[PDB]
Paper text:
Here, we solved the crystal structure of the endonuclease domain of Aquifex aeolicus MutL in the manganese- or cadmium-bound form, revealing that these metals compete with zinc at the same sites.
Arg406 is a component of the CPHGRP motif and completely conserved in all MutL endonucleases including human PMS2 and MLH3, the nuclease subunits of MutLα and MutLγ, respectively. The R406T mutant form of the aqMutL CTD was crystallized in the presence of cadmium ion, and the structure was solved with the Cd-SAD phasing. As was expected from the CD measurements, the overall structure was almost identical to that of the WT aqMutL CTD. However, the position of the α4 helix, the local structure around Thr406, and the quaternary structure were the same as those of the zinc-bound form of the WT aqMutL CTD (respectively). These results support the notion that the M1 cadmium ion fixes the side chain of Arg406 of aqMutL, causing the shift in the position of the α4 helix and the change in the quaternary structure. The DNA-binding ability of aqMutL was not influenced by these mutations, whereas the endonuclease activity was severely impaired by the R406A and R406T mutations.
Numbering used by the authors:
A (entry chain A), B (entry chain A): 0, 325 to 425
The structure:
Amino acid sequence: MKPTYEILGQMDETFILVKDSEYLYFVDQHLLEERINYEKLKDENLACRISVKAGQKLSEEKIRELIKTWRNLENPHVCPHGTPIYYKIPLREIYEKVGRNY
Amino acid sequence: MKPTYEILGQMDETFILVKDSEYLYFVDQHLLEERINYEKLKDENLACRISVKAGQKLSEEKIRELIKTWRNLENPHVCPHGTPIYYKIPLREIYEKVGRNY
Ligand code: NA
Ligand code: NA
């Protein structure tokens, strides 16, 4: 994700929505914190058990911290168990569906 | 869209994001206001020219009014010119990508 981005908020207390000029990302809060903790601790089970779970509301500040850190991970793409950390939509698919150039 | 829904906000001053239990909708603010005005006025050119344009920031209240009215349109799907009013993502595609049931 590009360095200029806009955080749109939490969805279902499970995903952080954040976009740059190319994609809208839906970032799984548990998988992201688990990757952050795993890269620090190098322990898959420990990183999992201490991380936030889906269904927890997160503050705006905590959300900003997580997204900032996501960009600097060695592996921002998959958690230690191999699950994708996020789903992404190219913004072009949204614009093109309504007939707008992008 | 179901009667219980959550408005997530504006994106790029062009789309309103709103979700129910099944889909996340990206609603083109211009196409929606144009449909609202067209169903009232029955004049395609008039409805277009008086409607909000992309690139205008909208207040939370105006966004609530638009989404409420969208649900009650005779044709909530396409504008008078035939363009889709919105793009939709099934929530299952977001959850399934990160390995979550939905
Ligand atoms: Na351990
Ligand atoms: Na006219």
